[PDB]
Amino acid sequence: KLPPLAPGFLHLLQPDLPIYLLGLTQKFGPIYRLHLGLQDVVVLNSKRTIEEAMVKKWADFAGRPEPLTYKLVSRNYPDLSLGDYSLLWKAHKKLTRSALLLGIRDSMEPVVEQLTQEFCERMRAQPGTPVAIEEEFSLLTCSIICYLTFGDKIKDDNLMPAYYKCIQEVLKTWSHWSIQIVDVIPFLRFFPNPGLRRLKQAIEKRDHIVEMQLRQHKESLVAGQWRDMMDYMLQGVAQLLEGHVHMAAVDLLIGGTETTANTLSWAVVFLLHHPEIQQRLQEELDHELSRVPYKDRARLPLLNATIAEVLRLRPVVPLALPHRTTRPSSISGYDIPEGTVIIPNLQGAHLDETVWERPHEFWPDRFLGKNSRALAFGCGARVCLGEPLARLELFVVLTRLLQAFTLLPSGDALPSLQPLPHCSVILKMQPFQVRLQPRG
Ligand code: HEM
Numbered sequence: 001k002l003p004p005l006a007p008g009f010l011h012l013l014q015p016d017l018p019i020y021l022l023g024l025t026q027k028f029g030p031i032y033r034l035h036l037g038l039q040d041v042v043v044l045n046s047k048r049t050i051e052e053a054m055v056k057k058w059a060d061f062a063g064r065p066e067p068l069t070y071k072l073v074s075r076n077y078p079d080l081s082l083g084d085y086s087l088l089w090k091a092h093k094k095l096t097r098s099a100l101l102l103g104i105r106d107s108m109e110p111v112v113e114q115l116t117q118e119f120c121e122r123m124r125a126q127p128g129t130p131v132a133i134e135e136e137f138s139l140l141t142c143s144i145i146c147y148l149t150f151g152d153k154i155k156d157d158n159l160m161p162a163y164y165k166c167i168q169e170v171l172k173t174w175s176h177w178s179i180q181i182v183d184v185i186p187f188l189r190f191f192p193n194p195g196l197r198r199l200k201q202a203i204e205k206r207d208h209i210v211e212m213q214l215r216q217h218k219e220s221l222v223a224g225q226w227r228d229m230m231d232y233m234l235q236g237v238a239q240l241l242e243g244h245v246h247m248a249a250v251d252l253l254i255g256g257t258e259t260t261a262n263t264l265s266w267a268v269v270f271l272l273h274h275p276e277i278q279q280r281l282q283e284e285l286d287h288e289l290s291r292v293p294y295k296d297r298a299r300l301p302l303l304n305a306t307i308a309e310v311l312r313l314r315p316v317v318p319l320a321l322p323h324r325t326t327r328p329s330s331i332s333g334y335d336i337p338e339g340t341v342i343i344p345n346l347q348g349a350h351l352d353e354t355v356w357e358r359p360h361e362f363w364p365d366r367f368l369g370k371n372s373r374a375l376a377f378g379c380g381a382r383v384c385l386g387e388p389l390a391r392l393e394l395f396v397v398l399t400r401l402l403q404a405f406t407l408l409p410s411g412d413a414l415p416s417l418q419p420l421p422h423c424s425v426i427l428k429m430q431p432f433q434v435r436l437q438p439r440g
């Protein structure tokens with residue numbers, strides 16, 4: 001007995017897809033089948049069902065599907081984030097996980113704190129002027145992941161301009177409806193598509209960039225020493241090959257910029273709507289205090305509760321990434337065949353009233369480590385690779401923003417909390433501007 005099948009196609013065209021999927025749980029329960037595109041796919045809409053699949057049945061769902069764009073972005077192969085579950089993939093992830101956790105065990109804090117301070121200095125240029133803060137956070141987060149992957153040469157040969165441009169374009173093209181439409185309806189591959197040709201030209205570099213940096217790290221590399229994440233990964237390689245390192249850097253770079261930047265932007269808009277919270281956060285910092293290190297963190301309980309709420313209420317990767325069943329299994333008492341694609345609806349799951357009371361409301365006080373955790377980063381074998389670095393950025397950036405600045409609306413009106421309807425992969429807010437006034 002398979003999970004119940006909701007009628008229709010293509011439910012993709014629904015305005016707020018994760019919220020549309022949540023609405024279907026009323027009639028069909030937390031777990032059901034439906035036609036996303038032309039394909040039959042099962043969707044999970046509660047923490048209990050997601051954790052049963054990903055945490056309890058670890059290996060059973062761990063896999064990835066392989067539609068055309070997965071192949072197109074890694075022709076030379078082989079990707080981590082889109083790679084299927086295998087023994088070699090596990091070794092792949094283990095290694096890059098070690099580069100983030102041990103390779104930059106030190107550095108990770110100082111590099112983050114140095115670049116956010118440059119960001120704050122850059123914001124002091126023209127106080128009380130309308131700022132495109134989306135683009136500013138994007139430059140900050142991209143800089144951070146670049147410096148940690150590639151090292152000193154980035155602003156030294158002054159490479160952030162070109163690297164930012166490239167990284168932005170790669171994700172911009174891939175996540176567009178053209179390109180993504182070939183994945184859901186395979187036969188449109190033979191159709192003419194401006195988008196695919198734009199994507200191929202955007203893969204050449206990123207590949208030129210990552211390869212140039214790969215070879216530059218290989219010369220000047222000292223065995224036993226590591227200045228960045230690439231130095232680390234190169235020395236754990238040569239069945240894991242340098243091609244694994246290449247794609248691992250790509251996954252770090254693209255996975256690490258727009259995700260943390262949009263989460264930061266979400267926190268901003270939420271803060272703007274709740275001057276009650278911003279003030280309470282300004283009062284908390286001024287009592288600990290000249291930076292408040294990540295080591296402390298617990299000394300600011302409402303800030304961690306606020307961060308957790310933004311992650312809970314606006315998870316930047318709302319439908320995670322698609323999972324593929326590796327062997328015949330079950331979720332919630334229903335038979336789940338091998339090869340079946342699974343969508344963990346993370347945004348919908350966080351909106352469960354049974355787990356979180358008054359669920360559509362922004363309420364940091366709810367987390368004052370108080371009961372029941374969200375999963376903006378997912379869970380199980382496919383957990384976000386960059387979570388530890390992500391949570392550090394959110395702490396350091398917002399902690400250094402709230403002291404030294406007061407967030408004010410750009411216009412006389414408030415910027416909408418409503419995320420734009422046709423989102424692919426990343427949950428983006430409507431383009432807004434902010435006013436930063438010194439002393440907060
Ligand atoms: C707060 C910001 C972030 C959020 C909410 C987030 C969320 C996620 C989610 C939901 C997944 C997929 C989980 C699944 O498939 O079940 C994921 C995967 C991934 N994220 Fe993130 N992420 C963030 C920041 C980052 C950063 C900073 C990096 C790298 C420096 C990164 C790199 C990755 C990679 C490489 C994967 C794929 C891992 C795999 O397939 O096993 N992310 N992220």
Ligand SMILES: CC(=O)[C@H]1CC[C@H]2[C@@H]3CCC4=CC(=O)CC[C@]4(C)[C@H]3CC[C@]12C
Binds near residue numbers: 170259426
């Ligand atoms: C979680 C997330 O949004 C990130 C993490 C890894 C990222 C992917 C890494 C591999 C990749 C390479 C490309 O050239 C196109 C975009 C993609 C397909 C990336 C899109 C965004 C992803 C899916």
